[PDB]
Design an enzyme around this catalytic site. Structure first.
Site, PDB file in Angstrom:
ATOM      1  CD  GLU B 425      -2.844  -1.266   2.343  1.00 42.17           C
ATOM      2  OE1 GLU B 425      -2.886  -0.300   3.145  1.00 42.17           O
ATOM      3  OE2 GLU B 425      -3.617  -2.244   2.412  1.00 42.17           O
ATOM      4  CD  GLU B 511      -2.630  -6.119   4.484  1.00 45.35           C
ATOM      5  OE1 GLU B 511      -1.413  -5.950   4.243  1.00 45.35           O
ATOM      6  OE2 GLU B 511      -3.329  -5.267   5.073  1.00 45.35           O
TER       7      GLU B 511
END
Ligand SMILES: [Mg+2]
Ligand SMILES: [Mg+2]
Ligand SMILES: [Mg+2]
Ligand SMILES: [Mg+2]
Ligand code: NA
Ligand code: NI
Lengths: 855, 858
Positions: B425, B511
């Site tokens: 991210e 994730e």
């Protein structure tokens, strides 16, 4: 209370929600008085301990001021108590109390140590607001030691029917117990019953004896008396007999307690229920072989104890008091002398439950003030009681001395722990003028005591016996002729012998002994600079003796019933050898403000001599303790840089070793064995008789080696008579001492990690300063700061150091000789307390205390 | 404390340090007085021993960092004399500075990558030496609890002047898939350094033999031709070993080999260097996913943060190994090291245990996250100073490249590591434009392909699901370079579009889920309302707004052959990020004490599983059977819906379940219900079970388990499992709670140690679980009794835990409340063999005592 109503227990706690003011000008007895700016306090309360030290006060009483304090409590009495009787009970107020209720003056009470009471019934507003006021006047100087000021013991309310057992109204005797033991035992009771109604009552009593805690299903004896008419407004003594079926004896090792319950019936219905605590036991004192309990010879291994609780001041907190007894029991103590004044009831309660024998002393001075203390009880002892003084508790027809003595006896007459009444201490010491009147005053006290309670011997502690004063000889014979016991203060071996020769008929004991003066953790000298004293047992006052000597002299003599060593615990005031009886500081300020007399310091931290006494007195543990701490900057170097190493032990043989710094191998330094001695009566003790024994006989009650200084560990091994090792798990004391590093860590531990959430119970938190490997640093004085979170609060901090003037209510204090104490008190809501101890540069330490709701 | 030959080429340098916490002291001088400093053995975390404060940040567990100084004094013998010496750090968090004997050697920012310093140049041979490390964890530096200090092992390397470089051997087997079973070609490259004053005529004798491990059982050896390497210079020596039929490294049989390199100068052996290796190959297809050694395998993975719970950040090998053992029992076969290089110890266990590791090197890139102005975001793009003598990776560009290549250098031969993840991210929780990220991304990819060619690179991007132009561009660059695209928090619908609009990408859930749950909480079945006891339901109906419940995130993945697998956030709870009571700035969240560890974990911080663990076990572990029931069955912990009916959930891999009830006081059970699964099979041949009864849930993924609504009544709910042939599955072959029963009040403790004999080395641990049970042995579901531990003998207590998030009680205390009936003590051995005794006590309850044997190192 905030409100009084049915149905609180007959006697209920009245400690909470008072208001307090220190002012000698305010007049605050009116119920409409504005007390909104006063402190809110819960009792017990001591208002000397919160004021500052000052050189204008006296060293004798810790340099702390007294003063005039006022206490106010406003509370409701509900309409549902309308025809009931209400009284307020004080277990002690120091001193010169004046009591008002709703604006009416009830009376007064001078003595700071005796319990008293006031009937509130006649002035009560039922179904309204009520205000009780207590004015207290501790005008200095009133004491030879730290007294404190205020309502320093519990306060209760008693609520009863118009027909009721009088205050402290049951007396119990078991005169043939020794013979009847194990079978039916005759109890002879007398019960005062009061009829405070406007009609005659037809009264029967239903009295029951059952195990404490404890239901009536398990009674061992009951009786119902024949009907006796008691007239309206009158009272009567009602005699009754209970046949107790094989009661269990109250003994030191098994202190069985019973409840003796009295139900008062009028017509067919119960109107009042009165309980008193009791134990079955008998004693004897013999001129030739001393003391016995329940027919078994017992040595009185005793301490004298003043009333205060260290950093708490005068406050008679039950746990604080219970903790003292516990620490003393661990030393082998089996008896306490309440020097020099009645104890808190809480101590009596604790000794009943723990199996400690109490010699309860009532007075210090008689009718002559001591040490220039013009406002002490000496001024009051022989005064009369005004007719309109409504105070209650004892006989009011002669003097205050009679009132306070009978008031004390009335409260404790049924307590099994109490074995003797002590009527005075050093009566003729520190006073001015003739002593020709003292024999008659003594005989008078002896007659009053005998008439108050025929079941116990009376005594006193007299320091002129060793001087052979005529008055003392006469006073001694008078005690004896009335079945009393003679206590001599500070006689040595030879004088014990002189008394016994000169007065063959006296039963005698050491009523005050030793007065050794030591600090905790002091080793860089071994004899009596820095306002501290050696911890070695070679330091005593001029009239006293070191611990080994005062014991040696008692243990050899079967006719010396026992000893009450001065003192068990250090106490505030009398900081001898820096004492002073008038105004002004002694030595440079800050001056020593508490005693050096105690085996245990004010914080409850034992000094080294503790383990000597334990080696002598406690047959339930073994002892192996070494002094000094082994750091170069704390030891004393004699000839050849040799350090005196001392071992206290009850072992038959000791091996002493040394381990060099960084080594795991120990080498043998020395080996010594004791010799067992036995007296005619069968007492045994141990003495060293090797050819390198000390020239002074009493110092051979312990072991000494002269050891060259070197860094590392000194350690000891203990062996029994059969040469079998006595392992470390069975032994108390430091069986090794080692050279420590610098201070690195704090280590805290709470004595009880679960306590009652009653706003009263305490947890004592010892914090040690240690090096990286956990050895207590012996001279550490790091300032420790406590952060208490959760359901409790810090009420005291202490280190037992006499010259430390830091506030006991602070959140921080220097350690002294490596140790510091914090005291935490619960609230009235169950929860958990978190305490973090911190010091600059050291690792912190945290303890966790749970508090449990009252059942 | 002294270093004498021949202590091993690399030796444990953990013992006998001195530590002080101070941002004022200046203690880099050998003369400086240590005497008052605390004495510590490494590894060590100095955040975990500090107090919680509302002045700190929820994100990092409300704990402080600060400046820590480490000092060790030791003697270098003449037994050595003239040899090379270096100190190696596996991790120091963070901003370390190193002096030796007074001379500043250099600095290292990143708190997660390994590094080294040559001590030879400034050493005092025959004398006394002082190494000093300064650590500066200036907060705010992290999105989660980092810890501070030298929290991983430290070693010394002692070699001859002519020696193999640090991590100096690279192994490749480019034709393994073809050659498997026959002669396998190994292409080696070895850096050999000559730090003497004369030239050396060098040959390499390299040998491959089975781990532990004599050379008499080698399967390949080679001796290279004599190479001349000049004084003060180094040479990359290539070689080739022909391996005779090596056993493969696989999940069920993780065969390991030692590759030994002897350096010979003239006749004799001057240096001997070993590296662990395993023979294995992988593939990622865009259509059918992942394969190991030619066989398709579904990545059943978890994300794992570095800390070890009540031990804080300390990378204790046994604590690490226990985590893996607990995940393996869940059926997990792969770990993502989120979001930073692992301890070498974790690479050692997976090598040995047969777990596939995705080793991620970075969280943020050159833009800091969450207001954490002191995180690695500020160091990423900085250059390395010329006089900074820190060793490990390449120094010619930025710290980003140094730490990336340092990690690849340490673990390039680790058979467990299948991929390098280069970020996570990267564009999330930052300020400014993202225009620059596709370039930064392509550069990291180029750095990795050049550093190690044998593994694909990857990352975890959460903006693919939002179809950012820059994420498309970066995914294409990934793919062009033989990469694999990990998408964070895609659902079924978003996995499909990715597959449609980008047919060339091979993808996986980097994730997933982020379900949020407390252990043992049942009086509500959803996080649909706002909590009031600072805990969350144990039912799988609770996840963050960007996430998904466990059955849903797995349902989406299992159904799709093109999604290679999943990495559930998280395997274990960790300290910090206590969502949904998280805070990114300063100050506390909700009333204090505030939640301070995560709820994301399948297993809590103490290693006690939450209920969903047995759901995953039923999906993943084909070596055991699962039959698990929730909730606990006491009236004050259950949730009653309409008709006073409690939702009962069964997680199982069985074909058929019979559900029973036994009234309190009876021995007769009645049948409540019976349900049977349907098997489903994908194109690639993966199988899964869903319930298709007429009373099935309207939400499909919830049919990966079984639910019954059952009226409350005192007694026992129990379950029977049957296979497809209607044959009972016996309890002895099944894990989970196959019954729940109404308990009485708390009555006794039951203690048990996971390992009853441990090593007396001062490192090894025994984990003691304590249960609070009634008179009949049933765990009381809401028991919170404070348990106290007495440790005596040849060990010491080092942690206590209950996994409860709002519990602020010190982990170093000898006591802790149980939470949901459970509490744990961690005990550590000493260096002397003996016996540990541990007694668990509590007010009002019977105590429980265990004895742990400790045995000497041979
Ligand atoms: Mg006390
Ligand atoms: Mg003994
Ligand atoms: Mg932040
Ligand atoms: Mg299975
Ligand atoms: Na003494
Ligand atoms: Ni005076």
């Amino acid at each position: 209370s905030s409100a009084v109503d049915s149905k609180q227990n007959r006697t209920s706690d009245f400690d909470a929600n008072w208001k307090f003011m220190l002012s000698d000008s305010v007049q605050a007895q009116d119920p409409a008085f504005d007390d909104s700016a006063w402190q809110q306090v819960d009792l017990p309360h001591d208002y000397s301990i919160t004021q500052k030290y000052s050189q204008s006060n006296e060293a004798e009483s810790a340099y702390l001021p007294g003063g005039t304090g006022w206490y106010r409590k406003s509370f409701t009495i509900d309409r549902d108590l309308a025809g009931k009787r209400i009284a307020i009970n004080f277990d002690g107020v120091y001193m010169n109390a004046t009591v008002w209720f709703n604006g009416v003056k009830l009376g007064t009470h001078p003595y700071g140590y005796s319990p008293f009471s006031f009937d509130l019934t006649g002035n009560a507003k039922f179904g309204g607001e009520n205000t009780i006021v207590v004015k207290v006047e501790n005008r200095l100087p009133s004491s030879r030691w730290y007294s404190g000021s205020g309502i320093y013991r519990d306060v209760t309310l008693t609520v009863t029917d118009g027909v009721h057992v009088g205050n402290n109204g049951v007396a119990i005797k078991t005169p043939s117990l020794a013979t009847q033991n194990g079978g039916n035992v005759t109890m002879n009771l007398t019960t005062k019953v009061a009829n405070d109604t406007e009609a005659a009552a037809n009264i029967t009593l239903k009295q029951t004896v059952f195990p404490k805690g404890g239901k009536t299903d398990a009674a061992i004896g009951t009786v119902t008396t024949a009907s006796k008419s008691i007239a309206a407004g009158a009272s009567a003594d009602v005699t009754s007999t209970i046949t107790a079926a094989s009661p269990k004896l109250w003994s030191i090792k098994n202190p069985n307690l019973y409840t003796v319950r009295t139900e008062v019936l009028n017509g067919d219905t119960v109107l009042d229920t009165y309980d008193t605590e009791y134990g079955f036991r008998w004693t004897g004192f013999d001129a030739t072989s001393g003391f016995s309990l329940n027919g078994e010879k017992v040595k009185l291994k005793g301490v004298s104890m003043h009333h205060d609780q260290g950093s708490l001041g005068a406050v008679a907190n039950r746990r604080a008091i219970e903790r003292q007894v516990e620490i003393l029991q661990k030393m082998g103590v089996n008896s306490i002398r309440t020097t020099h004044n009645p104890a808190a009831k809480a101590l009596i309660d604790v000794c009943n439950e723990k199996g400690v024998l109490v010699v309860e002393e009532v007075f210090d001075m008689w009718n002559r003030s001591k040490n220039g203390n013009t406002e002490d009880y000496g001024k009051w002892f022989g005064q009369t009681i005004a007719g309109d003084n409504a105070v209650l508790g004892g006989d009011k027809d002669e003097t205050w001395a009679k009132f306070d003595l009978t008031s004390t006896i009335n409260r404790d007459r049924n307590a099994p722990s109490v074995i003797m009444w002590s009527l005075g201490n050093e009566m003729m010491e520190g006073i001015s003028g003739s002593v020709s009147d003292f024999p008659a005053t003594s005989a008078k006290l002896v007659a009053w005591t005998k008439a108050a309670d025929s079941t116990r011997p009376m005594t006193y502690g007299d320091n002129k016996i060793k001087a052979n004063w005529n008055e003392s000889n006469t006073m001694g014979d008078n005690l004896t002729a009335n079945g009393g016991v003679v206590g001599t203060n500070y006689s040595d071996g030879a004088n014990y012998d002189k008394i016994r020769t000169t007065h063959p008929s006296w039963a005698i004991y050491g009523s005050e002994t030793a007065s050794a003066i030591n600090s905790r953790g002091i080793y860089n000298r071994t004899t009596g600079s820095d306002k501290q004293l050696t911890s070695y047992d070679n330091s005593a006052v001029g009239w006293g003796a070191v611990a080994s000597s005062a014991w040696y002299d008692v243990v050899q003599r079967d006719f010396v019933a026992g000893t009450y060593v001065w003192t068990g615990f250090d106490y505030l005031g009398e900081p001898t050898p820096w004492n002073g009886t008038g105004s002004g500081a002694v030595g440079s300020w800050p001056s020593p403000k508490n005693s050096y007399f105690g085996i245990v310091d004010t914080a409850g931290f034992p000094k080294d001599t503790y383990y000597f006494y334990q080696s002598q007195w406690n047959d339930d543990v073994h002892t192996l303790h070494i002094l000094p701490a082994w750091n170069e900057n704390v030891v004393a170097k004699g000839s050849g840089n040799k350090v005196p190493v001392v071992v206290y032990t009850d072992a038959a043989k000791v091996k002493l070793y040394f381990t060099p710094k960084g080594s795991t191998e120990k080498r043998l330094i020395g080996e010594k064995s004791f010799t067992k001695k036995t007296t005619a009566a069968g007492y045994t003790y141990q003495v060293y008789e090797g050819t390198d024994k000390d020239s002074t006989a009493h110092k051979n009650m312990y072991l000494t080696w002269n050891v060259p200084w070197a860094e590392g560990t000194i350690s000891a091994e203990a062996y029994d008579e059969n040469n079998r090792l006595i392992p470390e798990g069975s032994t108390e004391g430091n069986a090794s001492v080692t050279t420590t590093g610098k201070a690195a860590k704090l280590k805290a531990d709470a004595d009880r990690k679960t306590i009652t959430a009653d706003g009263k119970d305490l947890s004592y938190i010892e914090v040690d300063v240690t090096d990286a490997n956990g050895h207590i640093v012996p001279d550490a004085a790091n300032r420790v700061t406590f952060d208490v979170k959760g359901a409790g609060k810090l009420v005291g901090v202490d280190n037992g150091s006499s010259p430390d003037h830091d506030s006991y209510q602070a959140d921080n204090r220097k350690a002294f000789s490596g140790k510091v104490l914090a005291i935490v008190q619960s609230t009235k809501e169950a929860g958990e307390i978190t305490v973090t101890a911190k010091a600059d540069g050291l690792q912190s330490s945290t303890v966790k205390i749970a508090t449990t709701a009252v059942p």
